[PDB]
Amino acid sequence: MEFQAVVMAVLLPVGNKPLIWYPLNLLERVGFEEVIVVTTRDVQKALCAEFKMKMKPDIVCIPDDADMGTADSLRYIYPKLKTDVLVLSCDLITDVALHEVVDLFRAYDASLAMLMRKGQQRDFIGVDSTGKRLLFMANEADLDEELVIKGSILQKHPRIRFHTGLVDAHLYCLKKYIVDFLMENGSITSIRSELIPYLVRKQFSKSLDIYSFIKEANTLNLAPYDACWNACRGDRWEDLSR
Amino acid sequence: QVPTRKDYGSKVSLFSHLPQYSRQNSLTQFMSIPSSVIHPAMVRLGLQYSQGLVSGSNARCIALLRALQQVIQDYTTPPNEELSRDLVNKLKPYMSFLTQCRPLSASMHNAIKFLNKEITSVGSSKREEEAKSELRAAIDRYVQEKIVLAAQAISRFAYQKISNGDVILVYGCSSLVSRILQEAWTEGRRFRVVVVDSRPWLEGRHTLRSLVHAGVPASYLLIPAASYVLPEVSKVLLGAHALLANGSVMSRVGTAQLALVARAHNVPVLVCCETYKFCERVQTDAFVSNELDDPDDLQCKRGEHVALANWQNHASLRLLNLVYDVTPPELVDLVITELGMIPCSSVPVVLRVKSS
Amino acid sequence: GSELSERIESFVETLKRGGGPRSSEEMARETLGLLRQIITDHRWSNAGELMELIRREGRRMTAAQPSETTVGNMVRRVLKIIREEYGRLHGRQESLHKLLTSDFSFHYAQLQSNIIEAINELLVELEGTMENIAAQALEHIHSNEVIMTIGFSRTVEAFLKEAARKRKFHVIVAECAPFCQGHEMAVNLSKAGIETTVMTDAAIFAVMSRVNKVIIGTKTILANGALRAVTGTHTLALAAKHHSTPLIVCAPMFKLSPQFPNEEDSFHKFVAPEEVLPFTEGDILEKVSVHCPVFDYVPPELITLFISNIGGNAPSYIYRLMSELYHPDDHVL
Amino acid sequence: PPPLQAVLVADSFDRRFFPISKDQPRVLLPLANVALIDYTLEFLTATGVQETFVFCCWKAAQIKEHLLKSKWCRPTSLNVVRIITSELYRSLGDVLRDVDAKALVRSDFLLVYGDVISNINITRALEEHRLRRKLEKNVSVMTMIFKESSPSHPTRCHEDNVVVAVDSTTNRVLHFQKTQGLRRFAFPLSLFQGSSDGVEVRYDLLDCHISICSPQVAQLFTDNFDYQTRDDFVRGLLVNEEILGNQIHMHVTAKEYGARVSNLHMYSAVCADVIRRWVYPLTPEANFTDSTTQSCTHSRHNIYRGPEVSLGHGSILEENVLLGSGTVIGSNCFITNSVIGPGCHIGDNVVLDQTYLWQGVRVAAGAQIHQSLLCDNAEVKERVTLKPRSVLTSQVVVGPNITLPEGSVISLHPPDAEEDEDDGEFS
Amino acid sequence: GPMDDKELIEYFKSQMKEDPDMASAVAAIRTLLEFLKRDKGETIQGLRANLTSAIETLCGVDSSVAVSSGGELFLRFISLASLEYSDYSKCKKIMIERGELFLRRISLSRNKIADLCHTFIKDGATILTHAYSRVVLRVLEAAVAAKKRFSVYVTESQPDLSGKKMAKALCHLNVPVTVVLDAAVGYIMEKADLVIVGAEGVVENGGIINKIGTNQMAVCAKAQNKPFYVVAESFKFVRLFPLNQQDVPDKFKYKAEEHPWVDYTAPSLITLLFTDLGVLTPSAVSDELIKLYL
């Protein structure tokens, strides 16, 4: 058991099939049999009742609190975690071959592996020459109109490829000690906005490695309803195989 | 179960009996995530084997033994069965998967034989956790004795064969050779080293860096120019991947070339090898048993174009990337092992005294 | 006059900076044309002045690039032609017969025309050298043979292409690192339908046990039958000798140089270390000596046969051919 | 295409070579017994330049005398060399303003300094520059030449270290700055506003100080009178991208060599590279300058020996040694990684390591010189040991029975020299 | 101690002089055994140190390889005896008796070699030898006693004319022998059918250490496809691995312009070795040395 599937939800079935089904279906075809889902409870903790009518192999649902972050909800189910965690979100609708990411976590003994896609507050992504090792993680909120790179980083890696328009899939392969540190330091609220930039910064100061797989085929429809139609426009395209 | 890896490209007719894979192609794309048929440690080990993340024979053996220790730690016995049989039967698919990822080296073969002998020797009355701890301790002791103490003894033996003001020629990358040279320089010997490298791996560069970091003067050149530099060379120190029962030295391709040119230039040839790399099999040439690497590695960018790009378009064109070669015992003057300084013909004798 | 001087300077600078005529036959043709222009345009009275002028020009061209022996060979051939014409028009080798049985100041009006027509005949014979060498391919290649080559030799390519028109065989090509020109030879031979294999020089020994004969080109042929070939050819010759594999050198007659292997430290051509160790290595380049010799010396005892436009010969006969092409007094030049 | 021209600046307007440069201009300093301007002229001629303009202000008389005696001033040279001298020159901007005023350059000239050692062929770079000029209506004005290198190489001196941000698709220079004494590098996001793709930060580039420019570059230098160096022009052009963009591109070479001798460390690194044949075919035995006094023969372990050397008995030349014509070496000597000029006299039991001896240097027996530089006709007495990074300038005589410190610079000029001396270090 | 350096050297020289037939190594081993007999010690560490010092002194007396080989063999014998018996008092008697038996066996070794080697000489053969060797003399004596007829060529052995001594000793038993120069080995090689030489020391890889003219003789025999046979006793097996001629220790070359006294012959130039262990290939010496030292 090198991975435990974990699903974040803090969702309404906007589509032909329920939105949560597609990540569940992807995990099922990729080989998973035990899945952990954290359901929203701000409005009503009835998502477990809704999913109790599904025909998936095995699901373990847990209601969340009134308000919690992604990292906080990860901390919520710590006793249920024993190995490296595959953290996903219900909004993921993609036909990715997960071995394109998991292998990055396998071959290099990565501390964290993530999935991102080419696009149609921007995020600055700095990778190496091979295009796999993530060197820089930035958002315009924390920058005073000046992007700063340490001299030692360029000493070790004298070529940095910068991507401005890229969409994260919120698909993460995380080591156990990452979750242990997450519980040790309660300051972190969301893995997407603080934990990953913190790990990328700690990559250059017991070795820490961050890897990212960049895709150019399909991505997940964002939380806003504006892209909700677009996923449907592709849903029938992807429903034939899946 | 585990699918069969597909052969890549067209092979030379003389080498049609050997597998030939593609580096980009991996076996894990058709395997379940998380891994169930194959233990995750073995999956990761095979992934780094096929991509060439670990390459040295000693490094490959150490990584294999670490993965095996992890498997033994995670292993549990099934009801109405014995560990001595269940573990042996369970390890075989993992080794088949590893072989599919990349053909096993001689050191890994010997390690597998030793571990199988150790597991078979485990008594039925032994407790599960006692047996697992004993197996892990045996693996650690095997690593210690067969690698670290052997390298230290070989370095001490080779110190006596290195004198002040001599020129030593080395080939490729070998941890034993680098350690020997580093300790020889440390104890006070003053000399210079000539490093020989070959395409496409260019492993010798590694050794060069080590020498540069040790303060030892060093020179660098490719294998075709070796005949130019041997007139000033006094001794040739070669690492070995395996020693065969007939005294032949199985090593990186180009080693027998250097031995032949050194003999043509009247330069003695010294081979250092740990006794755990000795093999009972025999081999007269490099055709019967060898490894076929990725042919696309032979492509080189000369000028502004790659001449070998899309080489599969030509039906009659073939690309051969041999990994190993065999040096006959008549081209080797001395073998340095942890047992001492012996002739090549004494290789079977060691095989007789190690077994019993 | 001025145009001839510009041509000579351009040739010297091209030789010094490399490049120019890729083909050895093209370089020989250009050298012969330059020598013909020197003879025609420059003013001379007797044979001695012409010989001294040719000697000075050949010395300059040889000093421009000592590794290019074709220019010096052409200069010595022209000098021998001049000597033969002067002896034929004026009068009527060292040996025991000459030792036992016991002046170029004279001027003749028709000597220049004889020299020019002899040079033209030499050029005409030079044009058909490759076809003459390739016409002997069938006498040396049998059915289902295995041939081993190194680098990219145009003469060997013509040899194999002519042989493939009527026989089926396999050719193994070793990439002459660092300038892996063997890839071009392999793809060219594969385009002609020949089944070819690409391998590195490190495998030359390993596959040598399955090779029937070795056919290689050369840059220079020395007076004793030794070779100045591409680097790695000495190892190939040693491997062939270990297995008693016949080694055939397909080399035109204009690559014979009356020099001897006594010369040292100028034989091999040393180029920038970037070809062997890239500049991006960094700090370790400060304390590492990197040498990249382009050419290699092959002793005559490792060569089985020489195939030239005049046929096949043993190395032990090379001296006689060298006696028929060059006067012993022009070796120093 | 029109004939290719080149603008050669024979004046180093900085002052990094004092006190050595007081007597001899930096452009005429002997690196491997050959002046730097000779290397620059050979590089320009080899790459196809047919017209070279030489601008010299400081000590221009010696430069003119040396150039008129050189190979490139012969009528048979394909690269015609013109000498323009003015005492009002103060920077490269002044030279370019003069070029614009006199309209010397017609189209697509080459800009380089007089202390540049290179074997680069810019034919591909020139073709790319001309094609991008034709396609993009002469918007682009400058293409710089960089060598793919590593930050840890000796040729990557700290003073001239540079970090660049470019567009990978079109090789367009977006940001350019120097890393002199900086542990952090700041990149504005305005370049990211140009496009969401293509931005790449490069720190593996060595500044060959070679550029393919346009007459518009000279016009811009004339318009902005505050422009003094090339860095000022590049930074001003890059910051003012809103109006009259005038994009700057770049070209990277990986198989050829290019460097600039701007200080003693760079001088040592470039000399080591030249001796080790890294600038082939520009090698000591090639004799790219047609002079009989600089001929030599190459031998194993990179040993270059000139005519009439007569090495003494028991002396050993280990590796990377160049010997000038007429140099005399004593007995039981040990010379390694050193260049010795013509007409030198060396005593017995003297150990030279990584030293550079110019013509006329006499060294007494028993000396130990390491990583030091000796100028013309310098003298060293008996029992003298020179610590690394020592300089002796213009006939300095050093007394016996002393040991110089590491950073010892001695010259006949009192103020600039740290230890002014005439016949000894003790006053 | 009980025996001093002076009287140690005196005993060695007297034992050599009393029986000129006995080899230097046998005399050295006998002297070491006599030293062990009168030691008056009680610790196996002091006994080992004293024996090592005695071996150093004996090797200082004469610079032969065989003496050092015998010293190392004696040291290994002492180590094995100490391993067998922990108590020193019980160990000393075992060492003494085992040394007596060892002396008897190394005395019978020469006759064993002669009996096992005389069969390789044919009727009407031409045997080529290099210099004086008691083992070769005994081999030829045993061949003559077998009613075999053969001719012998010997070389004069220029540094000290022991070849003339060998020729006289062979004439003593009416053997047709000839004396040739050291420069005539290649000239006379085509006449000889096989080569028999002695050995002062057998190195680890199967090669031999012998008089200065042995190596060129073996090379000339190899160039003409002639068998090269070596007769050597077992106590001359030494764990030395000379890579070339310069690799031979200097304590054996000299004191026994420049004139080395010994040379090394590679195992590839040797057909068979005749020892008291039997007829062996050069590869068997390494096996013997490995088996001896665990």
mmCIF file of N, CA, C and O in Angstrom, chain D residues 315-353:
data_model
loop_
_atom_site.group_PDB
_atom_site.id
_atom_site.type_symbol
_atom_site.label_atom_id
_atom_site.label_comp_id
_atom_site.label_asym_id
_atom_site.label_seq_id
_atom_site.Cartn_x
_atom_site.Cartn_y
_atom_site.Cartn_z
ATOM 1 N N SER D 315 66.796 19.646 -16.041
ATOM 2 C CA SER D 315 65.571 20.421 -15.924
ATOM 3 C C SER D 315 64.399 19.659 -16.530
ATOM 4 O O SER D 315 64.556 18.891 -17.484
ATOM 5 N N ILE D 316 63.214 19.877 -15.965
ATOM 6 C CA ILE D 316 62.013 19.149 -16.350
ATOM 7 C C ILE D 316 60.912 20.146 -16.681
ATOM 8 O O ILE D 316 60.604 21.029 -15.873
ATOM 9 N N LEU D 317 60.322 20.004 -17.867
ATOM 10 C CA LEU D 317 59.120 20.735 -18.249
ATOM 11 C C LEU D 317 57.947 19.767 -18.149
ATOM 12 O O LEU D 317 57.816 18.855 -18.971
ATOM 13 N N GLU D 318 57.095 19.964 -17.141
ATOM 14 C CA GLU D 318 56.057 18.980 -16.853
ATOM 15 C C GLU D 318 54.946 19.022 -17.897
ATOM 16 O O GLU D 318 54.726 18.047 -18.625
ATOM 17 N N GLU D 319 54.240 20.147 -17.991
ATOM 18 C CA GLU D 319 53.126 20.257 -18.923
ATOM 19 C C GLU D 319 52.755 21.721 -19.099
ATOM 20 O O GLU D 319 53.019 22.557 -18.231
ATOM 21 N N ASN D 320 52.129 22.011 -20.243
ATOM 22 C CA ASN D 320 51.577 23.333 -20.545
ATOM 23 C C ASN D 320 52.635 24.428 -20.412
ATOM 24 O O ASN D 320 52.456 25.416 -19.697
ATOM 25 N N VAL D 321 53.744 24.252 -21.123
ATOM 26 C CA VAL D 321 54.877 25.168 -21.066
ATOM 27 C C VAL D 321 55.142 25.700 -22.467
ATOM 28 O O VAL D 321 55.216 24.926 -23.428
ATOM 29 N N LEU D 322 55.279 27.019 -22.580
ATOM 30 C CA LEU D 322 55.631 27.682 -23.827
ATOM 31 C C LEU D 322 56.957 28.406 -23.639
ATOM 32 O O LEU D 322 57.115 29.178 -22.688
ATOM 33 N N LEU D 323 57.900 28.157 -24.544
ATOM 34 C CA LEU D 323 59.237 28.731 -24.468
ATOM 35 C C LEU D 323 59.488 29.594 -25.695
ATOM 36 O O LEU D 323 59.311 29.137 -26.829
ATOM 37 N N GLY D 324 59.902 30.840 -25.466
ATOM 38 C CA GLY D 324 60.200 31.740 -26.557
ATOM 39 C C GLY D 324 61.549 31.467 -27.194
ATOM 40 O O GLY D 324 62.374 30.709 -26.685
ATOM 41 N N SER D 325 61.768 32.109 -28.339
ATOM 42 C CA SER D 325 63.024 31.948 -29.059
ATOM 43 C C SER D 325 64.152 32.661 -28.324
ATOM 44 O O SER D 325 64.019 33.827 -27.938
ATOM 45 N N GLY D 326 65.267 31.958 -28.130
ATOM 46 C CA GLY D 326 66.421 32.513 -27.460
ATOM 47 C C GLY D 326 66.422 32.369 -25.955
ATOM 48 O O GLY D 326 67.419 32.729 -25.316
ATOM 49 N N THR D 327 65.342 31.860 -25.366
ATOM 50 C CA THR D 327 65.293 31.664 -23.925
ATOM 51 C C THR D 327 66.291 30.591 -23.505
ATOM 52 O O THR D 327 66.416 29.550 -24.155
ATOM 53 N N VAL D 328 67.005 30.849 -22.412
ATOM 54 C CA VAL D 328 68.025 29.946 -21.894
ATOM 55 C C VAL D 328 67.591 29.474 -20.514
ATOM 56 O O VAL D 328 67.253 30.292 -19.651
ATOM 57 N N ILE D 329 67.605 28.160 -20.308
ATOM 58 C CA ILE D 329 67.159 27.540 -19.065
ATOM 59 C C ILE D 329 68.347 26.841 -18.422
ATOM 60 O O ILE D 329 69.104 26.139 -19.103
ATOM 61 N N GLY D 330 68.508 27.032 -17.115
ATOM 62 C CA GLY D 330 69.610 26.434 -16.389
ATOM 63 C C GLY D 330 69.444 24.949 -16.133
ATOM 64 O O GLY D 330 68.766 24.253 -16.893
ATOM 65 N N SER D 331 70.056 24.455 -15.061
ATOM 66 C CA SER D 331 70.054 23.038 -14.737
ATOM 67 C C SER D 331 69.178 22.764 -13.522
ATOM 68 O O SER D 331 69.059 23.598 -12.620
ATOM 69 N N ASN D 332 68.565 21.578 -13.514
ATOM 70 C CA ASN D 332 67.709 21.124 -12.416
ATOM 71 C C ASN D 332 66.556 22.093 -12.164
ATOM 72 O O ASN D 332 66.164 22.338 -11.020
ATOM 73 N N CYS D 333 66.006 22.647 -13.238
ATOM 74 C CA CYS D 333 64.861 23.539 -13.142
ATOM 75 C C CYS D 333 63.559 22.743 -13.173
ATOM 76 O O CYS D 333 63.532 21.548 -13.477
ATOM 77 N N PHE D 334 62.462 23.429 -12.850
ATOM 78 C CA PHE D 334 61.139 22.806 -12.850
ATOM 79 C C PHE D 334 60.130 23.875 -13.259
ATOM 80 O O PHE D 334 59.742 24.710 -12.439
ATOM 81 N N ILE D 335 59.708 23.836 -14.521
ATOM 82 C CA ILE D 335 58.758 24.794 -15.074
ATOM 83 C C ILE D 335 57.464 24.058 -15.383
ATOM 84 O O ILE D 335 57.481 23.013 -16.046
ATOM 85 N N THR D 336 56.344 24.598 -14.905
ATOM 86 C CA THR D 336 55.054 23.959 -15.123
ATOM 87 C C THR D 336 53.973 25.019 -15.274
ATOM 88 O O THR D 336 53.916 25.972 -14.492
ATOM 89 N N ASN D 337 53.117 24.836 -16.283
ATOM 90 C CA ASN D 337 51.975 25.717 -16.536
ATOM 91 C C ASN D 337 52.410 27.174 -16.669
ATOM 92 O O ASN D 337 51.718 28.091 -16.224
ATOM 93 N N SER D 338 53.560 27.393 -17.301
ATOM 94 C CA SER D 338 54.154 28.717 -17.383
ATOM 95 C C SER D 338 54.438 29.083 -18.831
ATOM 96 O O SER D 338 54.715 28.220 -19.667
ATOM 97 N N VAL D 339 54.368 30.381 -19.115
ATOM 98 C CA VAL D 339 54.698 30.937 -20.420
ATOM 99 C C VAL D 339 55.900 31.855 -20.248
ATOM 100 O O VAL D 339 55.869 32.777 -19.425
ATOM 101 N N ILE D 340 56.952 31.602 -21.021
ATOM 102 C CA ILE D 340 58.200 32.351 -20.933
ATOM 103 C C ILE D 340 58.463 33.003 -22.282
ATOM 104 O O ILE D 340 58.449 32.329 -23.318
ATOM 105 N N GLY D 341 58.705 34.315 -22.267
ATOM 106 C CA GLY D 341 58.905 35.059 -23.487
ATOM 107 C C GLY D 341 60.283 34.853 -24.072
ATOM 108 O O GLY D 341 61.160 34.197 -23.492
ATOM 109 N N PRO D 342 60.489 35.422 -25.257
ATOM 110 C CA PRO D 342 61.782 35.274 -25.933
ATOM 111 C C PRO D 342 62.891 36.028 -25.216
ATOM 112 O O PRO D 342 62.667 37.061 -24.580
ATOM 113 N N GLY D 343 64.104 35.493 -25.332
ATOM 114 C CA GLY D 343 65.270 36.155 -24.781
ATOM 115 C C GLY D 343 65.367 36.144 -23.274
ATOM 116 O O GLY D 343 66.026 37.014 -22.701
ATOM 117 N N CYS D 344 64.729 35.185 -22.612
ATOM 118 C CA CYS D 344 64.783 35.090 -21.162
ATOM 119 C C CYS D 344 65.983 34.262 -20.723
ATOM 120 O O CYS D 344 66.453 33.379 -21.443
ATOM 121 N N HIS D 345 66.478 34.562 -19.524
ATOM 122 C CA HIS D 345 67.583 33.831 -18.919
ATOM 123 C C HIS D 345 67.144 33.347 -17.546
ATOM 124 O O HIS D 345 66.746 34.153 -16.698
ATOM 125 N N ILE D 346 67.217 32.037 -17.329
ATOM 126 C CA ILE D 346 66.760 31.407 -16.096
ATOM 127 C C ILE D 346 67.935 30.671 -15.470
ATOM 128 O O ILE D 346 68.652 29.937 -16.160
ATOM 129 N N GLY D 347 68.129 30.868 -14.168
ATOM 130 C CA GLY D 347 69.224 30.236 -13.457
ATOM 131 C C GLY D 347 69.019 28.755 -13.213
ATOM 132 O O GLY D 347 68.294 28.090 -13.958
ATOM 133 N N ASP D 348 69.658 28.224 -12.174
ATOM 134 C CA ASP D 348 69.573 26.813 -11.832
ATOM 135 C C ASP D 348 68.732 26.622 -10.577
ATOM 136 O O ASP D 348 68.656 27.506 -9.719
ATOM 137 N N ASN D 349 68.100 25.449 -10.482
ATOM 138 C CA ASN D 349 67.285 25.076 -9.324
ATOM 139 C C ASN D 349 66.178 26.096 -9.065
ATOM 140 O O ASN D 349 65.871 26.430 -7.919
ATOM 141 N N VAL D 350 65.573 26.594 -10.139
ATOM 142 C CA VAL D 350 64.492 27.570 -10.068
ATOM 143 C C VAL D 350 63.194 26.865 -10.436
ATOM 144 O O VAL D 350 63.142 26.126 -11.426
ATOM 145 N N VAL D 351 62.154 27.083 -9.636
ATOM 146 C CA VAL D 351 60.866 26.426 -9.816
ATOM 147 C C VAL D 351 59.845 27.488 -10.204
ATOM 148 O O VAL D 351 59.522 28.376 -9.405
ATOM 149 N N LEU D 352 59.322 27.378 -11.423
ATOM 150 C CA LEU D 352 58.287 28.263 -11.939
ATOM 151 C C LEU D 352 56.985 27.480 -12.043
ATOM 152 O O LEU D 352 56.933 26.440 -12.710
ATOM 153 N N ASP D 353 55.939 27.975 -11.382
ATOM 154 C CA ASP D 353 54.636 27.322 -11.385
ATOM 155 C C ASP D 353 53.560 28.359 -11.660
ATOM 156 O O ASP D 353 53.367 29.282 -10.861
#
